[PDB]
Amino acid sequence: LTILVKKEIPRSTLDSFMQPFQSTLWLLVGLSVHVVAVMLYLLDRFSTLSSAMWFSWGVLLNSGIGEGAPRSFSARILGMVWAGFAMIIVASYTANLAAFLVLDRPEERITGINDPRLRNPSDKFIYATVKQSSV
């Protein structure tokens, strides 16, 4: 003898492509990209317009199209810590998708014939027995 129940499906949530887990956060990150480009252009202003319009998104998206390195090496150090931030951002993004994939499956199984769900007859666990049976 065993017990048959209904299969509950822990659905895959394939819709996470348009979701992905931040979902309120990367917008202000993209705004910080723009104001960091303004920081670079203002460092190079008094002592390069398209390198403000470009080369900020490209170094985090791994396509470096622009005016390249600034003549000020301090702004080059700022770009260094910037792209290091980009590196840990994309690494953490991959790591948390891999976490979101296979982390948990919700509990469906009963703990055998000595279940406290079974031992205490409650309303939400309706059992059955076919009439005039051996059991």
Partner 1 sequence: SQKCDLVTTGELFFRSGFGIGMRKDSPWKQQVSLSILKSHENGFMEDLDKTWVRYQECDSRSNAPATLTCENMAGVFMLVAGGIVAGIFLIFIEIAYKSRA
Partner 2 sequence: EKNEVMSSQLDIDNMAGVFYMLGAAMALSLITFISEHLFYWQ
Partner 3 sequence: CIDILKKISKSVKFTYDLYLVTNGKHGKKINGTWNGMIGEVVMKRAYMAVGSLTINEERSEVVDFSVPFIETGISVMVSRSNGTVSPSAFLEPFSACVWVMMFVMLLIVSAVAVFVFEYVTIGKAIWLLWGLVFNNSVPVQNPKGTTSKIMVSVWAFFAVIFLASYTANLAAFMIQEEYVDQVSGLSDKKFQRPNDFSPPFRFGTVPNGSTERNIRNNYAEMHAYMGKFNQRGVDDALLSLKTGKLDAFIYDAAVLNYMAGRDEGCKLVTIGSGKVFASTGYGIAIQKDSGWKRQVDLAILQLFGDGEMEELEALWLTGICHN
Does position 61 interact with partner 3 (CB under 8 A)? The reply is: yes
Closest distance to partner 2 from the beta carbon of 54 (Å) = 20
Residue 19 makes contact with partner 3 by CB under 8 A = no
Separation between Cα atoms, residue 120 and residue 4, nearest integer Å: 19
Query: What amino acid is encoded at 102 in this protein?
Result: V
Among 25, 126, 128, 130, binds partner 2 (CB under 8 A): 25
Find tokens 């301090």 and name the residue: 74
Nearer to partner 3, 6 or 105 (CB): 105
Query: How many whole angstroms separate alpha carbon 94 and alpha carbon 99?
Result: 9
> How far is it, in rounded angstroms, from Cα 21 to Cα 41?
32
* Residues in 38-57 at the binding interface with partner 2, rule: CB under 8 A: 39, 43, 47
Query: Least CB distance from residue 93 to partner 1, whole Å?
Result: 14
- Convert 57-81 to b/e letters by CB count within 10 Å (16 or more is b): bebbeeeeebeeebeeeebeebbee
Q: Which does 118 bind (CB under 5 to 8 A by kind): partner 2, partner 1, partner 3, none?
A: none
User: Is 49 near partner 1 (CB under 8 A)?
Assistant: no
Q: Which of partner 1, partner 3, partner 2, none lies near 74, with the C-beta cut-off 5 to 8 A by kind?
A: partner 2
